[PDB]
Amino acid sequence: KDTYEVENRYLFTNLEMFDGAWKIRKDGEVIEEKTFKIFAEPGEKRLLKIPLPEMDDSEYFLEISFSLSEDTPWAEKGHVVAWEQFLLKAPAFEKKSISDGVSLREDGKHLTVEAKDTVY
Amino acid sequence: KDTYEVENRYLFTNLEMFDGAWKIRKDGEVIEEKTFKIFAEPGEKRLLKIPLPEMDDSEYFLEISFSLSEDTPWAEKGHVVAWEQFLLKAPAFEKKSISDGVSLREDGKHLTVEAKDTVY
Amino acid sequence: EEEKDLEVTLITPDGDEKTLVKETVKPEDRVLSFAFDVKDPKKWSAETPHLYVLKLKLGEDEKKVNFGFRKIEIKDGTLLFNGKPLYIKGVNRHEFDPDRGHAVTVERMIQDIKLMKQHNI
């Protein structure tokens, strides 16, 4: 969950040329962003350690991305060349006992069901 | 759920000699009781209709018993000679997201976990 | 142009009467819809053909309809009538008379029905 293996598949490019970033998303919204650099020659595999926070019953998702450190003839600083995402933790589902009532009215052509301020 | 078939397996006795009762139990406590008599000769099967209440997310169980209408040389009025139970509705189980924290202290020979006012 | 009174009376198989509806109605092309409850009604079957009567009056216009309480349904591939398994003991009939062709009389219709019931159809 905290350990990730990066593999450089460029023929003639070191991964040091790119700005690394990782983000953690709680139920879709983010909560933690960090930048990093990683040295890896063409072909090489390198490990990446990501400290994780204590996590409540929400659903957590990591996203790891590389971008352009500075402008290029074909694109501007920050442009994203590669990303991958992973489920950290699934969510805990709640189930709630409902005590409140529901009415019902039958007529020739309709069944009517009332609950709070909604009629079906 | 409402309709039950009684079979009289005595050789020489009519079920009319016995006091019929049914009970409903919500999470184990009685909430409804009702007496009844049923005419059935030796061998016969008879139907028994039971009106059911509207039921919340709890677990309901129906019991149907027969007892002695009056004393006998071998037992008193109200002695039970037969009974059977049945599930009416399984319960709806709640799951609650917990937002409160938990503390952790490691030492040489013990891990200690505090939550509310209980230490494990 | 003038408004007319609408009355709807239910008559039981016994013969007892009850007013369901009594209201004035402005003259217009409309469809009025009503729903009424009836405790322990006498159910229509081929064995026991109990009929009720509706009596409908709007101004001087008067009509009468014969209905019977009965339910047909399919439960798990089985055909029910009033909540009992139904077995169709039937025959196919042509509206035919050897002297009159298709122009059959009520006296010949009644003969047919009494013959069918007397042979368990």
Curated annotation (Swiss-Prot), chain C:
Query: Superkingdom of this entry's organism?
Result: Bacteria
Q: Which family does it belong to?
A: Belongs to the glycosyl hydrolase 2 family.
Q: What is this protein called?
A: Beta-galactosidase
| Gene responsible for this protein | lacZ
